């Protein structure tokens, strides 16, 4: 058999991947790159096999020939007797989150405010909110809509990176990896929690998982849900309990991609590796947990219960859905 070469984005993911590799007896090994696009290029070169991707990145990968292999499945809201690996995925809710104390702010008054995004090209952080904004403004000038932002991956000298903070030394400002303090779901929600931004574009789960003691991290440990509101597209504000009626879209779950010629092997190896290290895995927590992180959401989201089989051997466009693909393609016309 062959080893599966994972691709880690930045040094915190590389550390995690090296722990997994040791525990897996080198059944998985690691390559590392600075950005998710650079990992996609290692996989297209055949210098890595696979990584797990937000849907916006699945679109970049898919356009280049890479295919979806298994998807993240989080705990289901409804009871199901199916094993996690065979349960249909449910999609997560992209939302716009503000502080309750910032009383004036609604969807219709976002212009010239300060925004926090997970990264350029990601679903809830960027494609859904910027795609809605370009459409409602009738303008491609989305880089001038908010007065300042943290949108990791944008030009570091531009207003889209002005709120980004880089690493403990302030290097790497705005890089789209976990060294940037405000990267990703948890970094963009921290940007809002600290009042660096007025609005954070994240998912529903992020607000719940970083409030009311669900996170023990210093900046989160004291946050209360009731201090946040969601912005609905009809201009209203709701409590964060109301995400099923106050979201921007439903996003396709993050998923593992590979070259087509390696998909089957990556799939088989992942199904085995989560039996060992996944939730309730044979060697989790004793030795290693694939879906927990030293920091946050490294390699996979920490709320992943398993990687699940996909139905219908779907192409990347089937997995993302036609409506999401068409929205991404419309937004990418601006660039």
């Amino acid at each position: 058999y062959t080893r599966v070469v994972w691709c880690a984005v930045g040094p915190e993911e590389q550390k995690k991947c090296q722990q997994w590799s040791q525990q897996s007896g080198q059944n998985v090994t690691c390559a590392t790159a600075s950005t998710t696009d650079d990992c996609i290029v290692l996989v297209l070169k055949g210098e890595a096999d696979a990584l797990n991707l937000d849907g916006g990145y699945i679109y970049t990968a898919g356009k280049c020939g890479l295919v979806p292999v298994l998807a993240e499945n989080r705990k289901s809201s409804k009871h199901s007797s199916l094993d996690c690996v065979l349960r249909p995925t449910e999609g997560y809710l992209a939302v716009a989150v503000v502080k309750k104390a910032n009383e004036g702010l609604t969807w219709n008054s976002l212009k010239d405010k300060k925004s926090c995004h997970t990264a350029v090209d990601r679903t809830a952080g960027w494609n859904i909110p910027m795609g809605l904004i370009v459409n409602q403004t009738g303008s491609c000038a989305f880089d001038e809509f908010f007065s300042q932002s943290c949108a990791p991956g944008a030009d570091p000298k531009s207003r889209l990176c002005a709120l980004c903070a880089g690493d403990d030394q302030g290097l790497d400002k705005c890089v789209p990896n976990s060294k940037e303090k405000y990267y990703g779901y948890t970094g963009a929600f921290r940007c809002l929690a600290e009042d660096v931004g007025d609005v954070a574009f994240v998912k529903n789960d992020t607000v719940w998982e970083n409030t009311n003691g669900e996170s023990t991290a210093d900046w989160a440990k004291n946050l209360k849900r009731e201090d946040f509101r969601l912005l609905c597209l009809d201009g209203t504000r709701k409590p964060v309990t109301e995400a099923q009626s106050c979201h921007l879209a439903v996003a396709p779950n993050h998923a593992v991609v590979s070259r087509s010629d390696r998909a089957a092997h990556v799939e088989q190896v992942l199904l085995h590796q989560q039996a060992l290290f996944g939730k309730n895995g044979k060697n989790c927590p004793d030795k290693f947990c694939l879906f927990k992180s030293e920091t946050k959401n490294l390699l996979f989201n920490d709320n992943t219960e398993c990687l699940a089989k996909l139905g219908g051997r779907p192409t990347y466009e089937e997995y993302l859905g036609t409506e999401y693909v068409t929205a991404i393609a419309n937004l990418k016309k601006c660039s």
Partner: peptide
């Protein structure tokens, strides 16, 4: 609606 970005 086009080619690979790389």
């Amino acid at each position: 609606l086009e080619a690979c970005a790389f």
